[PDB]
Design an enzyme around this catalytic site. Structure first.
Site, PDB file in Angstrom:
ATOM      1  CG  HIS A 180      -2.412   0.760   1.051  1.00 18.06           C
ATOM      2  ND1 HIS A 180      -3.343   0.169   0.037  1.00 18.06           N
ATOM      3  CD2 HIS A 180      -2.789   1.791   1.957  1.00 18.06           C
ATOM      4  CE1 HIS A 180      -4.371   0.910   0.134  1.00 18.06           C
ATOM      5  NE2 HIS A 180      -3.627   2.131   1.115  1.00 18.06           N
ATOM      6  CB  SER A 239      -1.574  -1.139  -7.967  1.00 17.55           C
ATOM      7  OG  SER A 239      -2.006  -1.973  -8.076  1.00 17.55           O
ATOM      8  CE  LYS A 249      -9.124  -5.493 -16.995  1.00 18.29           C
ATOM      9  NZ  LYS A 249      -8.454  -3.695 -17.486  1.00 18.29           N
ATOM     10  CG  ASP A 250     -11.111  -7.909  -9.495  1.00 21.01           C
ATOM     11  OD1 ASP A 250      -9.884  -7.609 -10.410  1.00 21.01           O
ATOM     12  OD2 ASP A 250     -10.656  -6.969  -8.549  1.00 21.01           O
ATOM     13  CD  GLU A 273      -2.316 -33.246  -6.527  1.00 22.51           C
ATOM     14  OE1 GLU A 273      -2.909 -33.933  -7.149  1.00 22.51           O
ATOM     15  OE2 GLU A 273      -3.842 -33.097  -5.411  1.00 22.51           O
TER      16      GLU A 273
END
Ligand SMILES: CCCCCCCCCCCCCCCCCC(=O)OC[C@H](COP(=O)([O-])OCC(O)COP(=O)([O-])OC[C@@H](COC(=O)CCCCCCCCCCCCCCCCC)OC(=O)CCCCCCCCCCCCCCCCC)OC(=O)CCCCCCCCCCCCCCCCC
Ligand SMILES: CCCCCCCCCCCCCCCCCC(=O)OC[C@H](COP(=O)([O-])OCC[N+](C)(C)C)OC(=O)CCCCCCCCCCCCCCCCC
Ligand SMILES: CCCCCCCCCCCCCCCCCC(=O)OC[C@H](COP(=O)([O-])OCC[N+](C)(C)C)OC(=O)CCCCCCCCCCCCCCCCC
Ligand SMILES: CCCCCCCCCCCCCCCCCCCC(=O)O[C@H](COC(=O)CCCCCCCCCCCCCC)COP(=O)(O)OCCN
Ligand SMILES: CCCCCCCCCCCCCCCCCCCC(=O)O[C@H](COC(=O)CCCCCCCCCCCCCC)COP(=O)(O)OCCN
Ligand code: HEC
Ligand code: HEM
Ligand code: HEM
Ligand SMILES: CCCCCCCCCCCCO[C@@H]1O[C@H](CO)[C@@H](O[C@H]2O[C@H](CO)[C@@H](O)[C@H](O)[C@H]2O)[C@H](O)[C@H]1O
Ligand SMILES: CCCCCCCCCCCCO[C@@H]1O[C@H](CO)[C@@H](O[C@H]2O[C@H](CO)[C@@H](O)[C@H](O)[C@H]2O)[C@H](O)[C@H]1O
Lengths: 244, 75, 71, 124, 383, 54, 85, 55
Positions: free
Chosen positions: E202, E206, E228-229, E272
């Site tokens: 923060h 971003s 958008k998410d 896996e």
């Protein structure tokens, strides 16, 4: 590894249940139960299936209760604390042919026949593997294969030598619905049945998935409209720059 | 390129009927449809998912013991 | 009679004839080799599993759909 | 890496005739393929700025240069989000790609590096 | 002043999910963060639900999972959702890490969120590994056996540590009960670290795909990135639906439907799919201890990207050579994955060694060289 | 159109009420529609189709 | 390095006029068909090599390796396998 | 957590696990101490008016 060590890979057969929208053929499931009961159940258990599981899949409630009531199960001890048996109820699990592993192996020249409740999920190939294996015992092993004693040649089984002999021959079962009981027919039916046993939610799961696909697709389309709508002021923004 | 009172060209994007109730109503139909399917989807999700907490099939198989009465003599 | 018997025979004589021949040639060689003495005291004993797999894999590809159609 | 480093090494290459003969054509192609000019940026607009030194160099830009940089960043961000490229006058022509910031950051760093050296001086 | 800003509690939500200033040009690869949050929520919901039906005793574990599949209402869904979402969690996490490496999110000033992120990735691996054991099928047992015997390579105390983790001399009931407790707990630790890497981020905000500052042009997180998410959430749920409802076993291994048998060893112990590249790296080194160190180093080496990337420019959008090198790095990481599941046979033994060298040499040689040269090309090329 | 807007959309209380009531109706009808469709594409295969023999 | 609304940490801005229109005034899907075709083509063409080169190379490597491995474990490959071990 | 084994698992903790007795009694007694401290903390808050504005 050599192909022998892996086992031959089974063909992709067109099962009725293959297909996003396709259920099992329940008439085949019923016929497959009859093959299990008359052939496999001699050596193989189906411990995860209770009589109630057949009801409304392959049998009516009455038919399944009839099957359960023919058997004896361990009851709670009587009032003197002596052991007792009771007739079976729908909640009972289908009982196995052997009391323990040791008894099973003793009856099968050392080999332990696995429980078949999950076998369709527990082998690569699923129904196709079961079908290929039961139908894939050649009359004669390929020249030069040396089988260990008590082994049978089957190319689908990894290593080639399986402790289970060929068991399905034309007319070992007499189907109650008049279907000709050929080796292939019986293998198809029993493979369908075992696949159902491993995944009994299959039919419901695929119907709910259809509903989910439709709703989620619509929501995806609408979400794209709404995104484009809310973003349009940002995408459409224009600038005019006058250097100070 | 210089005058800031000459609004840049937005004609490629402007709707002619932008001030009509029809126009607003359409976009709220999209928003509302999305809210409708989300509500229907959340209801389905919640109801199916929480039903795991209801008595399972093995439990339901153990209640409801049925007993005959033909076997039982008087006294 | 088992529908598979006829379909497998047809596929061996037809689309999988080259593979049928390979398997056949192999079996001839191996049987002949086993017939000869001091085969048991040889280093490498040939099988026909490879050729058998090629044949079976071929037959299955040409039969699977046809067989399930008649059940 | 420091801008100082980049500038010094570049000068070593540009001195050597052999080296420049092979490197300068490559660097020109590299810049063409890089494609920052198609968003209307000048090379120096791409330098990482979240550093004390770079913050100081940006504060020392002449107001005009600073205002123009802010516009180029806003314009490029708008092309980026629209997935469009610059057209016409928005494309940075090779002659417009001037190193407006390099002199400032070289002075900032010169002092910073002198300070580090002099913090380690030993009276003889 | 508006309540969302005035009230301390509301203000924290506000600062992260509503008024948070974001760059206006984030592309769809910035959506994996929220998908990872969604996976984490689905795993908590399905996980807690399975815990209400699962029994951690080794005599009953496998059967409790069958009870879930067969008797619990929608148990099949909850079980397959939980198992498949674990695979989707790793697809999203590899994507999120890939995004971060390509766009230089690990550079200053974002070294701290990146470094915490590397730990999140380790916790996820441990979490998923323990969960796999809880089924107590053949892959469960043989997985726990082999992986916990790697610890035996720690010198002097290694054997002692293994027996201490197992709670006995082999994988058995004590192991299963403690993996259950830890598998329940680890996702909560993981959630805390996920929250720490966001708080660390923060301070800088971003990054964005151009690698330039966004301080000049910000957008509120809501409504723009909220909406958008949603697109990727519905795209994810479409993929989820196709696996969970139509092919629930496609990503898994049939051997886990056979109950654990300490005597019988399965044909092939392969992890896996998402662990496969690290397994290939381990196989590459012939030494046991060497292999373990290499495998751990393959994850911890991510911590040095902030040092070895010498570029004056953040990210690869404008760096053609770096983009090519990144392409080769990513494809090699996939090839390692494939080599993790082949048999230890020629010619895959040597190939795996070459791919392992390539993996490490990206961080240690190529990225430092390429980033240095690109610096010089940008300067000379724009003179 | 204005009428429709004014009644169902303008007030969010009304809009949310309309969305939820629509969700209820959709849920009920979609259930029924899928049920029938599923039965037609899987005709003669399901237990309900063979039950009558027993 | 980032502030908050009102003091975000931008260099001073002057001289830029920004203009935009309401979401309700705009066609959200204006020119979508042109973009879906021509814009996607441009953007894909420009990035194609960076995907094609590494994918094609690693696929070739895998193909060669898997074919050799398959051949070594045939009868024909007995001798070459003996040397390889 | 299985009802056929729960009580016995707690006996196993008391009898077989090293320091199991301590861990079990610590957990059980600390639950009582948690409530002594919580009643005290609430009592403090009520007596000193910690519930008033601005708290
Ligand atoms: C899984 C879970 C499901 C959730 C879905 C999330 C995935 C969405 C995502 O992040 O990728 C979409 C993403 C589209 O995102 P975008 O925000 O439009 O642009 C992101 C790129 O930076 C913009 O890249 P660009 O503008 O350079 O466009 C490049 C792209 C074209 O991108 C387009 O979609 C057009 O085409 C290619 O790179 C294809 C290579 C050619 C192979 C033949 O797809 C790609 O661009 C994939 C490229 C990766 C290689
Ligand atoms: C998942 C749960 C979905 C709930 C749907 C119930 C109705 C809410 C909705 O869809 O959004 C409409 C409403 C409002 O959407 P809106 O904000 O676009 O509507 C405001 C403008 N009027 C009222 C004039 C149309 O959303 C909310 O109030 C928030 C709830 C989110 C869901
Ligand atoms: C497979 C190989 C992929 C290589 C990508 C090369 C770049 C490219 O063409 O991508 C398109 C785009 C190019 O986007 P861009 O932002 O560089 O360019 C946008 C357009 N211009 C140049 C005008 C600004 O790249 C991406 O979006 C890359 C995201 C990387 C995700 C990788 C996940 C792998 C997981 C492994 C983890 C360990
Ligand atoms: C936890 C895992 C989350 C993943 C969700 C995927 C679908 C799960 C729901 C089960 C399902 O298949 O629902 C179907 C409908 O699909 C649907 O309509 C569901 C898809 C909708 C996806 C998004 C909506 C909300 C999801 C998460 C919200 C969580 C908050 C509240 C729980 C079947 O329908 P049915 O007949 O079974 O339905 C009963 C009422 N008729
Ligand atoms: C998962 C299931 C998703 C379903 C819920 C979506 C909302 C349903 C429709 C409601 C709607 O569109 O109205 C907005 C509500 O959206 C909101 O307020 C939320 C916007 C988007 C919903 C969720 C955001 C996702 C972002 C991060 C994903 C995280 C995943 C991790 C778990 C308010 O419209 P408005 O507020 O724009 O203004 C407009 C004037 N009031
Ligand atoms: C009288 C013995 C006997 C009968 C009858 C029998 N089996 Fe088996 N079966 C075995 C034994 C023994 C094995 C284990 C063989 C081995 O592992 O070598 C086995 C193994 C199997 C396997 C697993 C092969 C594997 O991959 O491990 C399947 C599936 C199978 N049987 C299904 C059936 C079906 C279906 C039937 C009849 C419809 C059937 N069996 C009839 C004894 C029998
Ligand atoms: C990051 C979060 C999580 C991940 C990645 C994860 C992953 C897994 C995986 C891979 C399995 C093996 C699945 C299988 O094949 O059946 C599993 C099983 C399980 N997990 Fe989780 N898990 C997570 C969170 C949780 C949480 C919070 C719980 C809460 C208790 C939980 C409870 C279980 C249980 C009981 C099982 C065993 C039953 C089963 O196998 O389905 N999980 N988990
Ligand atoms: C549970 C796992 C994780 C979750 C839920 C998570 C969530 C997020 C979210 C929501 C963001 C901001 C939005 C975005 O950029 O996508 C983000 C950013 C970031 N995450 Fe993660 N993350 C996780 C794991 C990781 C891992 C494993 C790493 C690194 C190895 C990492 C490194 C970062 C970095 C560096 C950023 C800043 C990127 C930027 O915006 O430029 N995260 N994460
Ligand atoms: C935070 C939420 C708080 C309050 C919410 C309370 C919700 C809990 C309610 C559980 C209700 C389940 O009620 C029951 O649901 C199942 C689906 O789950 C329905 O079942 C129906 O659809 C399912 C698939 O969805 C089929 O398997 C089934 O054959 C069919 O009858 C039943 O018709 C209904 O009787
Ligand atoms: C993403 C999950 C959602 C939950 C949110 C995360 C919970 C934990 C977050 C709190 C940690 C402290 O978070 C810190 O809070 C304060 C106020 O909230 C923020 O402060 C920021 O916003 C406020 C107003 O909105 C301004 O006064 C301030 O100038 C600005 O920096 C910090 O930027 C943030 O780093």
């Amino acid at each position: 590894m050599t192909a022998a060590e892996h086992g031959l890979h089974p063909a992709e057969y067109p099962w009725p249940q293959n297909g996003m929208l396709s259920t099992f053929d329940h008439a085949s499931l019923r016929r497959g139960y009859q093959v299990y009961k008359e052939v496999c159940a001699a050596c193989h258990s189906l411990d995860r299936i209770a009589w109630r599981n057949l009801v409304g899949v392959t049998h009516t409630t009455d038919e399944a209760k009839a099957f359960a009531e023919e058997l004896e199960y361990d009851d709670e001890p009587d009032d003197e604390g002596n052991p007792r048996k009771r007739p079976g109820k729908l909640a009972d699990y289908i009982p196995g042919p052997y009391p323990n592993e040791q008894a099973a192996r003793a009856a099968n020249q050392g080999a332990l026949p696995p429980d078949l409740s999950l076998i369709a999920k527990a082998r690569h190939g699923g129904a196709d593997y079961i079908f290929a294996l039961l139908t894939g015992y050649p009359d004669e092993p390929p020249a030069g294969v040396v089988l260990a004693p008590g082994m049978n040649y089957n190319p689908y089984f990894p290593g080639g030598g399986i402790g289970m002999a060929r068991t399905l021959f034309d007319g070992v079962v007499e189907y109650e619905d008049g279907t000709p009981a050929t080796t292939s027919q019986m293998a198809k039916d029993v493979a369908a049945f075992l696949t159902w046993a491993a995944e009994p939610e299959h039919d419901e799961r695929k119907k709910l998935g259809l509903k989910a696909i439709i709703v989620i697709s619509a929501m995806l389309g609408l979400s794209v409209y709404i995104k484009k709508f809310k973003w349009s002021p940002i995408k459409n923004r224009k600038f005019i720059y006058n250097p100070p | 390129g210089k005058s800031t009172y000459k609004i840049p060209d937005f004609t490629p994007y402007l709707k002619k009927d932008r001030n009509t109730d029809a126009n607003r109503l359409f976009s709220y139909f999209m928003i509302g449809s999305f809210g409708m399917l989300s509500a229907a989807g959340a209801k389905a999700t919640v109801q199916d998912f929480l039903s795991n907490m209801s008595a399972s099939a093995d439990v339901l198989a153990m209640a409801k013991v049925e007993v005959k009465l033909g076997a039982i003599p008087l006294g | 009679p088992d529908p598979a018997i006829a379909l497998h025979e047809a596929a061996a004589e037809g689309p999988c004839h080259d593979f049928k021949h390979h398997f056949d040639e192999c079996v001839e060689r191996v049987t002949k080799a086993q017939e000869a003495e001091d085969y048991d005291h040889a280093e490498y004993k040939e099988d026909c599993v490879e050729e058998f797999f090629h044949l079976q894999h071929c037959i299955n590809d040409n039969t699977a759909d046809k067989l399930f159609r008649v059940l | 890496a420091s801008i100082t480093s980049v500038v010094k090494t570049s000068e070593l290459i540009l001195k050597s005739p052999l080296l420049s003969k092979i490197v300068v054509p490559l660097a020109k192609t590299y810049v063409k393929f890089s494609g920052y000019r198609q968003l209307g940026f000048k090379m120096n607009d791409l330098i990482i700025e979240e550093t004390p030194n770079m913050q100081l160099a940006l504060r020392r830009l002449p107001p005009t240069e600073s205002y123009d940089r802010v516009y180029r960043l806003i314009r490029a961000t708008q092309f980026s989000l629209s997935h469009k490229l610059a057209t016409g006058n928005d494309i940075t022509k090779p002659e417009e790609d001037d190193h407006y910031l390099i002199p400032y950051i070289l002075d900032v760093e010169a002092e910073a590096f002198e300070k580090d050296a002099l913090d380690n001086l030993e009276v003889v | 002043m508006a309540l969302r800003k005035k009230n301390s509690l509301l203000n924290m939500a506000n600062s992260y999910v509503l008024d948070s200033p974001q760059p206006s040009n984030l592309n769809y690869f910035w959506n994996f963060g929220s998908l990872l949050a969604l996976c984490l929520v689905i795993q908590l919901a399905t996980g807690i639900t399975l815990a209400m039906h699962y029994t951690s005793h080794a005599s009953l574990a496998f059967d409790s999972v069958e009870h879930i599949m067969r008797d619990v209402n929608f148990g099949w869904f909850i079980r397959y959702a939980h198992a498949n979402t674990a695979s989707f969690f790793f697809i999203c996490i590899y994507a999120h890490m890939g995004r971060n490496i390509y766009y230089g999110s690990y550079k200053t000033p974002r070294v701290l969120p990146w470094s915490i992120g590397v730990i999140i990735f380790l916790l996820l691996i441990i979490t998923a590994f323990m969960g796999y054991v809880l089924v107590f099928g053949q892959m469960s047992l043989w997985g726990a056996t082999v992986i916990c015997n790697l610890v035996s390579a720690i010198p002097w105390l290694g054997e002692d540590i293994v027996h201490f983790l197992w709670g006995g001399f082999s994988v058995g009931n004590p192991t299963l009960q403690r993996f259950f407790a830890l598998h329940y707990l680890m996702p909560f630790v993981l959630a805390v670290f996920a929250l720490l890497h966001l708080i660390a981020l923060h301070t800088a905000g971003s990054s964005n795909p151009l690698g330039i500052t966004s301080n000049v042009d910000k957008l509120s997180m809501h409504p723009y990135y909220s909406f958008k998410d949603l697109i990727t959430v519905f795209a994810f749920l479409l993929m989820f639906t196709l696996f969970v409802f139509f092919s629930p076993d496609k990503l898994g291994h049939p051997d886990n439907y056979i109950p654990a048998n300490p005597m019988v060893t399965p044909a092939s112990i392969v992890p896996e799919w998402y662990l496969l590249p690290f397994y290939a790296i381990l196989r590459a080194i012939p030494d046991k201890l060497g292999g373990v160190i290499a495998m751990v180093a393959a994850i911890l080496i991510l911590l040095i990207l902030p040092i070895v990337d010498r570029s004056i420019i953040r990210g690869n959008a404008f760096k053609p050579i770096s983009k090519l090198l990144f392409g080769f790095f990513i494809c090699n990481f996939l090839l390692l994955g494939v080599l993790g599941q082949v048999h230890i046979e020629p010619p895959f033994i040597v190939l795996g060694q070459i791919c392992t060298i390539f993996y490490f040499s990206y961080f240690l040689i190529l990225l430092p060289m390429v980033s240095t040269i690109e610096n010089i090309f940008f300067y000379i090329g724009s003179l | 159109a204005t009428t429709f807007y004014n009644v169902f959309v303008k007030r969010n209380s009304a809009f949310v009420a309309t969305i939820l009531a629509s969700a209820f109706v959709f849920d009920m009808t979609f259930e029924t529609a899928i049920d029938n469709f599923w039965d037609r594409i899987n005709a003669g295969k399901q237990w309900k189709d063979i039950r009558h023999k027993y | 390095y980032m502030g908050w609304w009102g003091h975000m940490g931008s260099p001073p801005q002057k001289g830029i006029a920004g203009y935009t229109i309401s979401p309700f005034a705009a066609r959200p899907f204006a020119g979508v068909v042109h973009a879906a075709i021509f814009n996607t083509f441009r953007r894909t063409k420009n990035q194609a090599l960076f995907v094609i080169l590494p994918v094609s190379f690693f696929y070739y490597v895998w193909t060669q390796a898997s074919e050799k491995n398959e051949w070594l474990y045939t009868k024909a490959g007995r001798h070459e396998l003996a040397k390889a071990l």
